[PDB]
Write a protein that holds these residues in place. Structure first.
Motif, mmCIF file in Angstrom:
data_model
loop_
_atom_site.group_PDB
_atom_site.id
_atom_site.type_symbol
_atom_site.label_atom_id
_atom_site.label_comp_id
_atom_site.label_asym_id
_atom_site.label_seq_id
_atom_site.Cartn_x
_atom_site.Cartn_y
_atom_site.Cartn_z
ATOM 1 N N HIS A 1 0.859 -1.210 0.000
ATOM 2 C CA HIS A 1 0.000 0.000 0.000
ATOM 3 C C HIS A 1 0.881 1.242 0.000
ATOM 4 O O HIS A 1 1.342 1.678 1.056
ATOM 5 C CB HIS A 1 -0.961 -0.002 1.191
ATOM 6 C CG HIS A 1 -2.037 -1.031 1.094
ATOM 7 N ND1 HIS A 1 -3.131 -0.882 0.264
ATOM 8 C CD2 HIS A 1 -2.193 -2.220 1.716
ATOM 9 C CE1 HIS A 1 -3.915 -1.935 0.381
ATOM 10 N NE2 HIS A 1 -3.362 -2.769 1.262
ATOM 11 N N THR B 1 -0.732 4.174 2.446
ATOM 12 C CA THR B 1 -1.381 3.885 3.740
ATOM 13 C C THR B 1 -0.327 3.900 4.844
ATOM 14 O O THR B 1 0.698 3.208 4.710
ATOM 15 C CB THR B 1 -2.138 2.555 3.706
ATOM 16 O OG1 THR B 1 -3.095 2.603 2.645
ATOM 17 C CG2 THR B 1 -2.847 2.274 5.015
ATOM 18 N N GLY B 2 -0.578 4.688 5.891
ATOM 19 C CA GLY B 2 0.238 4.701 7.108
ATOM 20 C C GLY B 2 -0.293 3.723 8.136
ATOM 21 O O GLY B 2 -1.232 2.964 7.840
ATOM 22 N N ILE B 3 0.304 3.748 9.324
ATOM 23 C CA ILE B 3 -0.041 2.817 10.423
ATOM 24 C C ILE B 3 0.339 3.483 11.744
ATOM 25 O O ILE B 3 1.377 4.164 11.798
ATOM 26 C CB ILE B 3 0.645 1.450 10.210
ATOM 27 C CG1 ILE B 3 0.223 0.427 11.269
ATOM 28 C CG2 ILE B 3 2.160 1.592 10.115
ATOM 29 C CD1 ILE B 3 0.607 -0.997 10.934
ATOM 30 N N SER B 4 -0.499 3.312 12.763
ATOM 31 C CA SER B 4 -0.259 3.878 14.105
ATOM 32 C C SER B 4 0.814 3.059 14.822
ATOM 33 O O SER B 4 1.171 1.967 14.347
ATOM 34 C CB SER B 4 -1.525 3.931 14.921
ATOM 35 O OG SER B 4 -1.932 2.631 15.318
ATOM 36 N N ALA C 1 -0.861 -0.228 16.505
ATOM 37 C CA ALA C 1 -0.978 -1.291 15.487
ATOM 38 C C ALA C 1 0.408 -1.811 15.104
ATOM 39 O O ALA C 1 0.523 -3.008 14.785
ATOM 40 C CB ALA C 1 -1.729 -0.789 14.273
ATOM 41 N N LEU D 1 -1.358 -7.062 6.213
ATOM 42 C CA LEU D 1 -1.249 -5.630 5.848
ATOM 43 C C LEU D 1 -2.104 -5.322 4.617
ATOM 44 O O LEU D 1 -2.606 -4.189 4.527
ATOM 45 C CB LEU D 1 0.209 -5.243 5.608
ATOM 46 C CG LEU D 1 1.068 -5.158 6.867
ATOM 47 C CD1 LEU D 1 2.504 -4.825 6.506
ATOM 48 C CD2 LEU D 1 0.504 -4.140 7.848
ATOM 49 N N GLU D 2 -2.272 -6.283 3.704
ATOM 50 C CA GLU D 2 -3.166 -6.115 2.536
ATOM 51 C C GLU D 2 -4.620 -6.021 3.004
ATOM 52 O O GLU D 2 -5.338 -5.117 2.538
ATOM 53 C CB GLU D 2 -3.009 -7.271 1.551
ATOM 54 C CG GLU D 2 -3.932 -7.162 0.351
ATOM 55 C CD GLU D 2 -3.878 -8.364 -0.575
ATOM 56 O OE1 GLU D 2 -3.130 -9.316 -0.268
ATOM 57 O OE2 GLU D 2 -4.585 -8.350 -1.602
ATOM 58 N N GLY E 1 -5.168 -2.802 4.995
ATOM 59 C CA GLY E 1 -5.232 -1.669 4.062
ATOM 60 C C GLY E 1 -6.566 -1.602 3.342
ATOM 61 O O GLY E 1 -7.048 -0.483 3.085
ATOM 62 N N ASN E 2 -7.155 -2.759 3.025
ATOM 63 C CA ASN E 2 -8.500 -2.823 2.407
ATOM 64 C C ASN E 2 -9.561 -2.388 3.419
ATOM 65 O O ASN E 2 -10.493 -1.663 3.024
ATOM 66 C CB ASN E 2 -8.799 -4.219 1.865
ATOM 67 C CG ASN E 2 -7.924 -4.578 0.684
ATOM 68 O OD1 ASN E 2 -7.606 -3.725 -0.144
ATOM 69 N ND2 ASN E 2 -7.531 -5.838 0.599
ATOM 70 N N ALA F 1 -8.996 -0.364 5.910
ATOM 71 C CA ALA F 1 -8.745 1.077 6.102
ATOM 72 C C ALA F 1 -9.387 1.868 4.963
ATOM 73 O O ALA F 1 -9.969 2.935 5.230
ATOM 74 C CB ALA F 1 -7.261 1.359 6.194
ATOM 75 N N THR G 1 -6.496 6.509 5.882
ATOM 76 C CA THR G 1 -5.185 6.185 5.285
ATOM 77 C C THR G 1 -4.185 5.772 6.362
ATOM 78 O O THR G 1 -2.991 5.651 6.040
ATOM 79 C CB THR G 1 -4.661 7.368 4.468
ATOM 80 O OG1 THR G 1 -4.554 8.503 5.327
ATOM 81 C CG2 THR G 1 -5.575 7.686 3.304
ATOM 82 N N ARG G 2 -4.647 5.563 7.594
ATOM 83 C CA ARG G 2 -3.817 4.996 8.676
ATOM 84 C C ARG G 2 -4.491 3.738 9.204
ATOM 85 O O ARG G 2 -5.707 3.770 9.469
ATOM 86 C CB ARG G 2 -3.613 5.995 9.813
ATOM 87 C CG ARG G 2 -2.582 7.072 9.521
ATOM 88 C CD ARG G 2 -2.546 8.068 10.659
ATOM 89 N NE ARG G 2 -2.269 7.423 11.938
ATOM 90 C CZ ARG G 2 -2.385 8.017 13.121
ATOM 91 N NH1 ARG G 2 -2.773 9.279 13.200
ATOM 92 N NH2 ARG G 2 -2.115 7.344 14.227
ATOM 93 N N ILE G 3 -3.713 2.669 9.349
ATOM 94 C CA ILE G 3 -4.208 1.400 9.926
ATOM 95 C C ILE G 3 -4.216 1.548 11.445
ATOM 96 O O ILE G 3 -3.139 1.671 12.051
ATOM 97 C CB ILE G 3 -3.367 0.202 9.467
ATOM 98 C CG1 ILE G 3 -3.445 0.041 7.948
ATOM 99 C CG2 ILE G 3 -3.812 -1.063 10.185
ATOM 100 C CD1 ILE G 3 -2.460 -0.952 7.387
ATOM 101 N N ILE G 4 -5.413 1.551 12.022
ATOM 102 C CA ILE G 4 -5.640 1.542 13.488
ATOM 103 C C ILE G 4 -5.793 0.080 13.901
ATOM 104 O O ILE G 4 -5.971 -0.779 13.034
ATOM 105 C CB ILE G 4 -6.860 2.418 13.833
ATOM 106 C CG1 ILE G 4 -8.130 1.924 13.133
ATOM 107 C CG2 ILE G 4 -6.572 3.874 13.495
ATOM 108 C CD1 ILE G 4 -9.386 2.653 13.551
#
Ligand SMILES: [Zn+2]
Ligand SMILES: [Zn+2]
Ligand SMILES: [Zn+2]
Lengths: 82, 116, 99, 346, 102, 100, 86
Positions: free
Chosen positions: E26, E29-32, E35, F50-51, F54-55, F57, F63-66
């Protein structure tokens, strides 16, 4: 011939196992259900039990492969390993 | 050379389970790099207490069944009647055991008499 | 027989002597003997693996009687752990200050 | 307000009866049972309830005088069961003394000391009869109340144990002297041929204990037999009417009598049973019903304990019968209020 | 320039590697950090699972060497369904690439 | 100086996996291909989650994975749910699944 | 010494807390005797987990319970928790 060995588990066999389990009355749809569940319970063991036999480069599935496949799933069986 | 009485480590500890066998099975099983001297003595004492408790309850279960030989039914009744051994061996199947003779109090027919 | 020579170890000759110390006339079958052998191997591998994790957690490359003591305090439930820790401590203290 | 109740007496020249010594309150309903002074109504109600309640951990679950939960100390002389809070000791006799009392386990309490005047404490003569009057006014239930036995006028306990031995228990509990066998406990396995003449020959009895068989059904005799013979020899052992003498009894059932026999026993012993559960090892272990006239024994039953769970435990114990020891330790505790009645051997 | 104020042991992680894999799958796409801690604990957990399973597979056959075959059998035991059938192909492709990269 | 990570076309460190196999007291010896194979397996199991995260999200317009996105990514797929059946993900919640 | 014994904190688990945990669990209607049973089960669960974690703290020769000892106590009971270091 090569398809009806799931029916080799008979109605009195499931009757005796449910009498041991303390079941007073059994409905007519139990016997189709249990043959499903037991079959799944064999697969999840034998899929593992063949796999140890794969890694040992053997062709015989020993009792130790069954004990290790059950120990992996948290069903440690006694009295088959020295 | 050495001139001393060949006294095994089991006998100095007052135990029965072999200290040397437990020590080489700790050294063989890849548990840590170094293995202390008191550790196989302590573990042999723990195993000997856990063996003696189950054999005492199995000898009581054999004496109840009028038998002078422990069958796996006796080990089954010995472990499953005890609550701490049943907690220890909850996810453990013992071969040729069966189950406990325990029937629920709702499946029995009412063997009572009406007071009125 | 020199090519037929492979001795698998067990715990039969020990569990038999512990049984004769507890019940001086009661015997035991070979199937129950294999169940007691698998029980001793099971509890052995439980306490050894738990003590190995308890050594690896504290960055220590040595297993002593303290890791086995806390592994017994974790794995055995209730009063059984207390009696096993008492018996183990008594046997270690008898072992250290012996002849 | 706990340093003020030590100021209302010395300075204001007020009567101790006019201040609630428990929570420091100024409102007084009645007069305090053990010592001279007044008690507010809620503390009064709770104080009576606390005596009935039985705690495994300590002699008293909540404090004797003020009925506080924490700050519990143990009495020095082992022949006394009194327990007081730290705040009562600090408030009444002076600050920094409670710590000194708690610091030793051999500190003579207020009732064991020759003089009962500590500085702000007054004892009562023949207090037990006044105490019975206190129960009579508000406790709404006249529970079996034998005169208290003073330490100076103390007798060696004469024990009659029927169908079950308690000499080990009482020895551990300090009721029987070890090393010397004058025979202050007679264990009698078979009582079918006991007669009043035999009991009179055996010497006068003060405490007669009986108990049901253990869960392994050792003997092939109906369990009601133990109850009925216990009642008979009990009545024989009761002192001659019109005599100031203590007579205690206790019959203990380890769930071996059904509801029929239970009502029968409750009717003869003229009270409802006392169900005691044991320390959970995950779910439930075992339980025991007790009849007695010993103080703070009826309130020992715990309302949380259900009948159906008890029936299930009984049927899992009767059929399985793994352990077969009489639960001596389960019924060991219940004699603890009796400590102030007979001499203790440490 | 200021340097070495507070001596603290560098706790290793997998955070920059999971960041690289996330930018490969991705690109925006970022991540915290929470996570990221979960993904770090996941990689540690599955590493311990496959390593312990391979240790048991080595001890059962009286062999004191963990090669790619023990890891392959551990993956075929631990990952259910298609996860094993793709992870074995990915691992075999990686070992084939690694052996013939000289 | 060519690292073993790019020598096998992987992303996870071959050397760190190699020294964590040698440190963890698993066996006496550790093979050369084993950390390469295990780094590839861990890289595939990371890339799949992660795929799916991301889907999840992109469905949530973020645009951030929580950790909610990792929760929905693991619980919706049945093979990853079978892999992590006894695993609690923190800050995750549960699936919005109401019985009929 | 200088430590007041904490008591009656099982009633700190309030009725709307068990209500909200039943809403997340999908429960439409809760009976009046649920709350005592739920407090009892949560108390036994915390007893088991803290009984493991205090023993992990004991063997480490510390007096502080860490998050890693909680993760080890839960991973020992077959409940692997993420987000705090495995
Ligand atoms: Zn008051
Ligand atoms: Zn006293
Ligand atoms: Zn007080």
């Amino acid at each position: 011939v090569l398809r009806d060995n799931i029916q080799g588990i008979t109605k009195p066999a499931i009757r005796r196992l449910a009498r041991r389990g303390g079941v007073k009355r059994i409905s007519g749809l139990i016997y189709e259900e249990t043959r499903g569940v037991l079959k799944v319970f064999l697969e999840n063991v034998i899929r593992d039990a063949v796999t140890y036999t794969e890694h040992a480069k053997r062709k015989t599935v020993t009792a130790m492969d069954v004990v290790y496949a059950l120990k992996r799933q948290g069903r440690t069986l006694y009295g088959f390993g020295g | 050379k050495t001139r001393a009485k060949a006294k095994t480590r089991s006998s100095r500890a007052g135990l029965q389970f072999p200290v040397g066998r437990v020590h080489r099975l700790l050294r063989k099983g890849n548990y840590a790099e170094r293995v202390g001297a008191g550790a196989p003595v302590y573990l042999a004492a723990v195993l000997e207490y856990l063996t003696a408790e189950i054999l005492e309850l199995a000898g009581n279960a054999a004496r109840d069944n009028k038998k002078t030989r422990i069958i796996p039914r006796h080990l089954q009744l010995a472990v499953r009647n005890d609550e701490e051994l049943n907690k220890l061996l909850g996810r453990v199947t013992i071969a040729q055991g069966g189950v406990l003779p325990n029937i629920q109090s709702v499946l029995l027919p009412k063997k009572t008499e009406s007071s009125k | 027989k020199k090519r037929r020579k492979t001795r698998k170890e067990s715990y039969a000759i020990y569990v038999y002597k512990v049984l004769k110390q507890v019940h001086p006339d009661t015997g035991i079958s070979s199937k129950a003997m294999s169940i007691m052998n698998s029980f001793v191997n099971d509890v052995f591998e439980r306490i050894a693996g738990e003590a190995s994790r308890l050594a690896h957690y504290n960055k220590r490359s040595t297993i002593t009687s303290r890791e086995i003591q806390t592994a017994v305090r974790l794995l055995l439930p209730g009063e059984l752990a207390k009696h096993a820790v008492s018996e183990g401590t008594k046997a270690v203290t008898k072992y250290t200050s012996a002849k | 307000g706990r340093d003020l109740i030590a100021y209302e007496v010395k300075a204001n020249q007020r009567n101790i009866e006019d201040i609630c010594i428990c929570c420091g309150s100024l409102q007084v309903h009645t007069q305090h049972p053990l010592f001279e002074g007044g008690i507010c109504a809620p503390c009064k109600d709770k104080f009576l309830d606390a005596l009935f309640l039985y705690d495994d951990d300590g002699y008293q679950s909540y404090c004797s005088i003020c009925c506080s939960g924490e700050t519990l100390l143990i009495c020095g002389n082992p022949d006394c069961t009194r327990c007081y809070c730290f705040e009562c000791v600090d408030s009444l006799v002076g600050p920094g003394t409670s710590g000194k009392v708690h610091a030793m386990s051999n500190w003579v309490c207020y009732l064991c000391l020759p003089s009962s005047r500590s500085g702000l404490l007054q004892r009562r003569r023949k207090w037990r009869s006044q105490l019975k009057a206190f129960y009579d006014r508000e406790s709404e239930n006249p529970l079996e109340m034998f005169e208290t036995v003073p330490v100076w006028r103390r007798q060696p306990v004469r024990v009659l144990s029927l169908f079950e031995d308690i000499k080990k228990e009482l020895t551990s509990l300090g009721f029987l002297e070890s090393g010397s066998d004058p025979g202050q406990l007679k264990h009698v396995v078979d009582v079918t041929d006991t007669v009043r003449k035999d009991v009179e020959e055996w010497g006068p009895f003060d405490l007669v204990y009986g108990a049901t068989p253990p869960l392994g059904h050792t003997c092939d005799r109906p369990p009601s037999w133990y109850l009925f013979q216990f009642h008979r020899l009990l009545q024989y052992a009761r002192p001659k009417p019109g005599s100031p003498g203590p007579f205690f009894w206790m019959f203990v059932d380890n769930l071996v009598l059904n509801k029929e026999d239970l009502d029968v026993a409750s009717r003869f012993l003229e009270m409802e049973p006392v169900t005691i559960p044991d320390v959970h090892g995950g779910s439930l272990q075992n339980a025991v019903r007790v009849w007695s006239n010993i103080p703070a024994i009826r309130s020992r039953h715990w309302a949380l304990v259900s009948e159906e769970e008890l029936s299930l435990l009984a049927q899992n114990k009767q059929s399985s019968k793994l352990a077969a020891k009489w639960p001596t330790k389960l019924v060991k505790n219940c004699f603890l209020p009796l400590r102030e009645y007979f001499k203790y051997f440490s």
